[model samples]
Target: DLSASVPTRPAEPERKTLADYGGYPSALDAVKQKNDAAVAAYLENAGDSAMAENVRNEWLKSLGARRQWTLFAQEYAKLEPAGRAQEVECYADSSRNDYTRAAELVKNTGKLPSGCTKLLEQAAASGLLDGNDAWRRVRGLLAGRQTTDARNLAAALGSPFDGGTQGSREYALLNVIGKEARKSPNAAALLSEMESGLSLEQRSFAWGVLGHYQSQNLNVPAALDYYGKVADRRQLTDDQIEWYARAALRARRWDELASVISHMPEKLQKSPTWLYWLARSRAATGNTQEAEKLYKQAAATGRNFYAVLAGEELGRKIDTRNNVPDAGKNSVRRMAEDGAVKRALVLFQNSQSAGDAKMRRQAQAEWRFATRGFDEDKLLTAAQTAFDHGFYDMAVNSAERTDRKLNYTLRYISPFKDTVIRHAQNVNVDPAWVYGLIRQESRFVIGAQSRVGAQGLMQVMPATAREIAGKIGMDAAQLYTADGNIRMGTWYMADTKRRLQNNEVLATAGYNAGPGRARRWQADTPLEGAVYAETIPFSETRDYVKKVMANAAYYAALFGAPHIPLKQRMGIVPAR
Candidate 1:
C-alpha cells in the first residue's frame, strides 16, 4: 500500500560501509565511534570490505523503522555482498512481524536488486513470518481488491516448521467449506481429518467444533458416527456434550447417546439438566424406572424445562424464570453502609482522573461488548482467579484480551484521584469505566491530543463536549476542561437514562452520538441491535458505541454490584 507514494529506488551513494577500499586508517577508527560519526566517516572513506560490512549491519539495525527499507537498499548492502545480503535478510526477518508490509515487499520484489530478492526468497524458503504462506496469503486477501492478479503472486503458504501460528486463515476457510459441504458425503472424512490435524492439546477443540456443526447441520446417523469416535475424556466440556445430546435426541440415536452419557463424568450425571438427557436416552432403550426418575428431577429445577428445551420431554410443567428481579431490588450501595463499605466507597470517590470525555466514552463502549472487562487490572485479576481455579487455559485468554482503556490512559492522561471520581459521580458513571476509557483512548500522556483533535484526560472532542454542554446550559468556552466535560457527560447519561429508561444500550448509543441520534436510531432500526450496528456506515462510531456500553456493564460487575450484568442493567433485554 505504501508503494502508492513511496519514493522510487534512488541511486546508491558512495559506499560508506567499509573503510576506503585501499584502506583509510580513519575509516577503521571511525568503526570505534560505533555511533553517528562512525557511520558518517565510513560513508566518506568507503574502505575495507569486512569492516564496511560490519558497520552496515550494525547501522541498519539501529536505523529508524521508517528509514529501514531505504537503508537496507542503499546503505546497508552497499558494504560487501554477504553483508548486503545479511542486511536484506535481517530487515526481512526483523520486519516479519508486519505481515502486510512484508507481503507488500514480496509482491514488489521486482523493485529490489537481485541480492535483495535472493535474500527475501531465502527468508521465505526458510519459512520466515509464517513458514507456509500466511503473510503472502494475507496480502493476497487484502490486496485482492487492488490487483486482480495479486493473489496469484501472493500464495499464503502452510504453517511454518517453526516460529509461526496456524491462524484463522485456514480455520475461517474450513468453516466456510463445512457450511457448503453440510450434507456432503465427504463431510465426515473432512471432519475426521480436521480432528487429526490438531495437536493433542487442540484435538478436543477440533472435536467440539466438528460435532457442534455436524449436530446442527447433519443427520443423526452421520453426527453420531462422528461423535462415537471422540474420546469421552475429550468430550468433557459440558457445553459440547449438551449440544451432542440435543443432536442425539433429534436423531433418535438413543443407544449411542446412552453409551456416551454413561461414559461422561460422574459430576455430569448428578445434574438435573444432564439427567434429563440421560433419561431420554434410557426411556428410548426401555429403562422406564430410571428414565422417569430423571425426568422428575429435571422438571423440579426452577424453570429449567421452560428455559431449556431438553427439559420439555421430562413431563414437568415449565415456568418462566425472570432474567432480572423487580425494579425496586435494583442495586445501589444500600440504605446504610458499614465501615468496610464506606472505605471502599471513599477510595473510589477519591479516584480523580482526566482525559477526553468523548474518547473515554468511545473506549469504554468498545470494552463492554466483550464477555470480560477489558481493563488490565480486571483482566489480570480475572486471569489470576482462573489460574487459581485450575482454569489456566481460560487464564491464557487473559493475555489475548484487548483493553483499549489502557491505551488512552498511557497516551493522553495524567492521574488525578479527585478529578476522575468526582466527574464519575457527577455523571453517575463508574470511575473505573472512566479510568479504563481514558487508558484506551489516549493512554494518559496529556498534551495528549488525538490526530482528530480530541483533547485532555478523557480525550473529549471539543465540539462533542460543547454539544453536551449546550444541553445542560454550560458556557461553550468551558466545555474542554475536566469540570465541564464531567458535568456535561453526567447530565447526558442522566438524560439517556430518562429516555431509554436507563437502558445502557440506549444511553451508550446516546453517549457516543447525540441522545437525539441514539433515540432516533432505536426507533428507526429493527429489533436486532447487532444488525443495526453492522449497517452503520461509520465503522468507528459503530464499534465505539457497542464497546462503551459493554465497558460500563463490566464496570458494573467489577467495582459496582455483582448481581448486575450490563445487558440487564442497560435494558438490552425486554423488561420482565
Candidate 2:
C-alpha cells in the first residue's frame, strides 16, 4: 500500500509510494544522530501529556523486569495502546510465575476484557501442547469439568447432530474416544453409517476409527476396506496415498495397486513407495525393459530411501541422487538471466519429461534448486481484495498470473484484518498501521524466518518471542510452532499497542528498537510522530516502523475498513 496525501490531518504529509521498510543501511548510520537533536528540542517544552506519552513506552518495557503491579498499572495507564498490552502481558506473567500476584491480577483483570484469558485460550488451541495441562492452568479461569474437564469433554460437540459447529467438539471427541470407538459396537455402527454422509475429511477420520478397530481385531479385509476408504477421500493427501498404496500391496492385490497408482498424477509418483509399487506392477505385466527403467527412476527419486531395493530390482547400482548443479546456481539463474536456455529448459521439463529418463535422472538435483513456485490461491485472494477496492487492472493482472503447480505455499492473513482489529478492540490501536509493519516484517509468512533467526509467521526475534513467552508463561518451545508463533506474535503486537499509547509510531518504533529505545527517543523529543520518525537514530528502524504504520492505513482501505486518522494512527494525536 503506497502512501497518499494526508487525509484530513495536519500531522503527516502525502507519501508518493507504498512503503515496504527497506531503507535501513543508508538511514541508520548517520541521519539518526541528527534526528536526536531535533527530538531533544521538542521534549524540552512539551506538555505533561507529551511527557506522559513518552514515559508510557518506557513503563511498558520496565514491567517486563519489574514486580510492583501498583506502579505497574499506573505506568500502564499512561502507555500507548501497544504499551498497555505489554503491561497486561506483564501482569499475566507475574500471576503465572507468582500465584498470589497472579490471583490478585486475575481478580483485577476480571473487570478488563480478559485479554490474558483469550491469549491463554489461543495457546491451548494451538495443538502443540497437552490438553490436560492447559485444562489445569485454565481450570481456575474457566472452571467446571464439563467435557473440557479432559474427562467429560469427549462427545460434547463432534457432529452436526452432536451440536452446533462441531469443528471444535469433534476435535475433542477424537481424544475422548481414541481407538475404543471400535470396541463399542454402537459407536462403530454409528460411525459406519455416518461415513457416507460426512465430508471427505470427516469420512477419513471415521474410516480411520473403523480401521483402528480392524487393526485391533486383526481383520485384514475390513482393515483394507477402511484404509482404502481413507485413500478414496477427495484431494487425497500424501499420507493417504502412502497408506492405501501400501494397503493394496499388503492385501496382495497386485492388479489393484496397478489400477490405483496408474490413475495417480506424477507429483505423487515422486514417492519412492509409489515407485516401488510401479516397479512391481510393470514387472508383473511382463514389461521388463519398462520395469527396469521405472526401477531406476524409483531409486533416483527415492533419494537414498529405496536405493537398494530399486537397484536390486533393476540389477544395477542406481544412485537416486545426482550431483546436479543448483538451479539457483545454474538453471534459474540462467533462465532469469538468459532468454533462450530458460525457454529450452522449461519446454523440455514438462510433467512428461521424466519419461525421458536420461534427462531427468541427470537433472534431478539441478532442477530442485531452481523451482520455487508461486501460490495461486494466495494470488487469487490478493487479487480479489484488490478488485474489491476498484483496482480493476491490478485485480485482472493478479488473476491472469499463472505458474507451474508445485508444493503448497503458505499465505498469511493481511495484518490489516488481524493486527488492526485485535489491536483496536483490545488496546485501541488503529488497524491500518499494524498492517504496514506486517507487510515489511514478515509479509505474513507463518514460517517467515529472518537472518536474525526470528522464527515462524511474524519473523519475531527469538528472544522477543522468548521474552513474551516467559512473560505470558508459555513454554519456550511453543513459540516455534505455527500457532504459538502467531499467538505470541499477535499478543506481542497488541502489547506494543499498549506501549506506544495506541500510537502506531512509537509502537512500531518500540517493535524495532526495544520499547526502551522508543521511550528514550520519545523522552528526548516529544515531537509529532512524523517528525520523530524522520529524526530517529536508526534508519532501518525508522523506515520500517513508519512503513508498517503507513501500510496499515492502506491495508485498512484495501479491506474496506474505514480509514484511520493519521494523527491517531501515527501517535501524533494527543489523547489524555
Candidate 3:
C-alpha cells in the first residue's frame, strides 16, 4: 500500500509521508545516479523487503567498485554475502589494512584480484610455497592462467615440480597444449610431427585441437585421422569429443560413431541428441532391437527436436503434455499482490521510455529471484497472471519452471494466431512450422528485436524485411506489425524452403542462420535429417533448428492434426 500510495501521489506533494513510494524510488533513482545518501534512506524505512534488498545489494556492489570502503563496510556487514560478493567483502577488509583476513581470504579463494597482487606476492614469499600448499598454490595459479607464476614456483621447488610430467600430469600437459597452440606459428605441423615424446595427456590435447579445427572446416578425412591418434576419449575435453563426433558424422563413418558416442560420459549418452544419433548408428550397423529400444527411450526425454524424430522412428506420436488444472482466483490474487510482480508491472509499463533498459534488467532480476522457489501451483497462477497481463515472455518462463506440470499452451501459445495462419496458408508453409519458428525467434513478442538487429515476432532483419516487402509489392513501414511481419517472415521461410528443395530442417536452419549458410550445410551424400542438424557447426543454429522443429511438432499436435511424424517432417538432407 505504501508503494501503491507513492505511485498515486499528487504532483504537489511534499516529502512528509511515513509510508510512500517516495523513499524506494528516491533510493532507486539515487542509486542509479550514485547518490549514496538516498539509497541509505530507503533501507531505513519499513519497505526494505526483497525489492529493497535487491536494490541494496546492487548499491553495495557500486560502492565496492568505486573503492568507497567505508560505505561498503557499513552496508555489506548487514548482509551475508555469497560467492563473489564475499570476495568484495575481502577487498573491503584489505582496504582496512587487515592482512590476517586478507591472507585467510586469499588461501580460501581459488583466485585473487589484480588489486591483491602485492598481498599475493607477500603470501607467496611467506613459507607458503613449501609442502602440499605449494602444489595447490601452483595449481591455483595455473587455473587462473597465471602459468608464469606456476613455472616460477616449479623453479623455486626444484625437484618435484621439475621439467617432468610428474605431480599433476593432466594440468601440466593441459598447460602445454594451451601455451603451444595459443601462440603457434604452424599448428598443423605441431599436431602432425611434433608432440611425439609428450605424455598421452599432452598429445591428446594437441590432436583434439587439430581434429576439431579440421572437422569444423569440413576436412573429414584428416580430422578423423588426427582424432584416431588420441589414445583415450577421457583425455579430450567435452567440446573436443563433440567435434570428434561431428567429424565421424560428416565422414559417414557410422561404425566409428557408435564407439565414439559409447565412450562419451553417461550424461551425454542420456541426452536426446546423442541418444538419437547413437540409435541411428546402431540401426545402420544392423542392431535393430537395440536401435529401436534406444529410440523409444530417446523419445521419452521431453519434447525436443530429437524426441520427435525418435518417436517417428518408433512409429508413434511425440509425447504430448497432459492437461493441468487452471489456477484459482485466490492463487492469481496472491501473485498480483507480490512486490516483485508489482515491480515487474511498473517496469514493463515504462519499458519504452528513455533509460528503461536498466529498469527492465532490474525488474527481470527481481522477478527471477521472486519466482525461484515457486511451487507448481504457485507457478501456474503466476503464469496465468503474466498471460492475463500480456506478458508473454514471463508467462512462458513461469510455465517452463514446472518440473512435471507442463502447460504447453502457456509455454508455446500462438500469439497473432489468425495472422500467422493466414500468412502460412498464403505462402504454402506449415502453420505449425511458422509457429515453431516464431516461438523460437520471438516467443510472440510483437516488438522483439535480437542484438543482431532482427526485429518483430518473426525476428526478420531490417534488410531482409525490406527485400521481402519489395518482392511482395508492399511498403516495409509496418514491418514490425503482427500481420506484415508474419507475412514477410512466412514468405521468406517458404522461399527458403523451396530453395532447399522443401527440406524443412534446412528451411528452419535458413530461417535462423540465413539461407546462404543453410545452402552451405547441404550434405555431399544423402543424410538423415537428424544427422545434418546434429553436425551443424554453430551450436546456436543447431539448437535453434531442434527447438523450432520440436515446437512445430507440438503446434501440429495442438492443432489436432493427425499423425505427427517428426521423421517425415525432418525428411532427408540431400546432396547438392
Candidate 4:
C-alpha cells in the first residue's frame, strides 16, 4: 500500500530499518517528510522503543505547530507529557474555544512556552480566573518570563499584589525574582534583604535556587553563605542538598560536610560518593576508626571512582573481584537460551549487513527493550550472550541491570585490547587511563559520534581529528575505525597530559573541558585533588575528572600494574 503511492513518493531514504513488518527507512527522513501516519504506525508497532519515541516527539511537535489538533490530541494522549508541550495543549483547547479547559491545563502545567499569550488572553476574557488563581496565572507567566504578559497581568493586579500579607506573598516573591534573576551577582544580596518580607517556604526555596546556581559556578564561599541563610535545611531538594555537600567539601568545612551528608536519605548516604565524602569528613574530624570502617565499606562497592578513593584512604587499592564471583557460565548459557534473548540475538545478527547502522541502532533498541522483562539472573545471561557477540556496549548495559549482584567482567570490559595497548604504549600513555577515557567517552562504541560532531571511540571532534589525521598520514574516513581513533585519541591525551604538567586530574579535566579552562582551574594554593575535582565549574567536566581518574585506578589494578595510589596519580596540581 505504501508503494502504491509511487508518483508521490519522496526520495529513497539513506538507510531503512526493519522493525515489526516493513523496512521503514530513516526516522530522520520520516520526520523531515512529515510522514505523520507512517511515524505513528511505527511507534504503535514498536511500543516504547527509543527511536520511535524520538520520532514521535518530533512528529507531535510538528503536528502542534501546523494546528493539526485532531492528530495532536490523539498522539498527545499517547505521550508521557512533560514541560513545553503543555502550552501547545492549551493552545489546542483554546483553538476549539474551550476556554475553561485551556485555563485548567495552563494551571496544571509547570512551564509555559512563548505561545501562552493568546491562551492567557482567552482565559482572562472567559472570567474563569478568580483572585488567587489569577495571581497563580501571573506566577506562571513569570515562570516563563513572559515580559509583556507579566506587565499586562501586573497592571491588572494594580501593582498592589505585592506579598504584603497572606494573600499576596506568591506575587510579591515572584516579582522580586523576575526583576533580579538576571543579575545573579547582586540577586543573592537582594533576596536576603527580601527574605524577612517573604514567608518561610518562599525564603527557603529562593535561597536554595540562589545557592545552587552559585555553587554550580564554583563560588563555594558565596554558595555556602546563601545555603546557610535558608531558614530550614530540610526544605531543600535532593539536588540542592547535593550541591550543598559539594560546596562544603570545596570550602574544606569538614564538620559542615559531615553534617550535610549524615542527614541525607539512607540510600543516598549508602552510595559510594557519599560514603567516600563521609569517610573523609570523619577522618578530618579525628574519627579514624569510623572513617576506616566507612572507607572499607566503600571499597567493597566496586572498582570505580569512589571505590579507588576509598581504597586510597585504607592504604590498599583492593580489587573487589577477589571477593565477588561472576554469574556461572552454565547459568549464563541457560539464560541466553531463552526465547526473548534468542529473538534479540536474531535482530543483532540482522544488523551486520553494510549500510545497516540504522538497523543496528534498531536492534540495539529492540535488544535492550526485550531485556526489560527479565530477572537479574537472566540479565547476567543476556550480558554473557552480548559479550560473546562482541557487543561490549550492550554487554555492559545488561550487566548493570543485574540489580542484586554485579558481573564486573561484563561491566568493565576492555575491548580491542591489542589495538588499545599498541597505540597507548606507542604514545607512552597509560593504557588504563586510555581505557578509562574510552569507557566514559564512547563506551567502546567504535562509530560513536557526539551531538557536536565528536566522532569515534574517543569522541574526537572533527576539527581535532583532521589535524591529527594529517600529521599521522591518514585520511579522514580512517578516523572512524577502532585502530585510527585509538591512535589519534592516545596522541591527543598524551599531548594534553604533557601540557598539563603531567597531573592526571588536570589532564582529565582538560580532556573534557578545554585545556585552557583546565589550566585556568589550577588552584591558587596547594589543594587536595579531590577538592579540585569537586570544584570544577562545569558539572560535566567535574564528574568526568572524577570518573576517568577512578576508572584509571581500577584499570591499573586489573592489569596487575604497580599499585599507583590515586593520590600519586592526582599529583598536587600547581597554582597558576
Better of 3 and 4 by TM-score: 3
Candidate 1 residue 466 Cα shift, in angstroms, is: 3.2
lDDT of 2 by residue, 1-576 (tens): 111111111111112000101122222222234343333334333322222233333433444334546655655554445324544664555444433223323222011233344333333343433433332222222111223332222222122224454334344444323444445656555666555545555555456555545533434476677666664432333333444554455455777777767655566775665676678778987877877877888766522224435665665532212122111222222232222212213322431233442332212221221221224443344334333433232333343353321111111135334434554455444454544555567654444556778775556787888788888888877766655765676677779757766655676777777877776555332455544554455658856765665455445545556544443544462322
Model 1: residues with Cα > 4 Å off, grouped in runs: 1-90, 94-145, 148-417, 420-436, 443-447, 475-477, 494-502, 513-562, 570-576
Which candidate model has the greater TM-score, 1 or 4?
4
By TM-score, how accurate is candidate 2?
0.30
- Summarize candidate 3's per-residue lDDT along 1-576 as a digit string, tens digits: 001111111221112221333355667678779998777777775332345666666777678667787888787777644323444554555566554543343342135554453344444455443344444455445544666655555455552345564444535444334534533446666555546666665566567766776676666787898789887665555567888998888777889988899877677789888898889889989999999999988877866777777877887775556567666666575566666566565555555443344445445554565566667767777777778877777788788777667778887787777678888998888899899898888866777778988988899999888888888897886686778888889999999888887888988888888888987877678877877887787889989998888888888888877755777777789886
TM-scores, all candidates, are 0.35, 0.30, 0.75, 0.72
Q: Give a tens-digit lDDT track for model 4, residues 53-130.
A: 456666766776677878877776775444225556566666677665543543431344544555655565556555
lDDT of candidate 4 vs native? 0.69
lDDT of 1 by residue, 1-576 (tens): 001111111222223211133243444444444355667665655423233454555555455233446545566546544334433454654544333334444533123433333334444544554432333333223222322222222332333322245443333334423334434666556656665555442444335545655654434455566555665433234445555665565555778667766755566666654576677678878998888777766555432221123344543222222222221211111200322222212222222133233323222221221213234444433333333333222233443353321221111222555776787787676565565455444444333457777765556677876776667677865655656655655565566666765655556555566566665544222233432332232446656654554444333334434444322333332221
Global lDDT scores for all candidate models: 0.44, 0.45, 0.69, 0.69
Model 1, 31: alpha-carbon shift in Å?
21
Comparing 2 and 3 by TM-score, which wins? Answer: 3
Q: Please identify model 4 stretches exceeding 4 Å from their true place.
A: 1-185, 262-270, 289-293, 296-303, 311-316, 320-337, 403-406, 470-477
**lDDT: worst 10-residue window of model 3:** 1-10
Show where candidate 3 strays beyond 4 Å: 1-186, 283-297, 313-315, 319-321, 350-363
In model 4, the Cα lDDT at residue 451 comes to 79
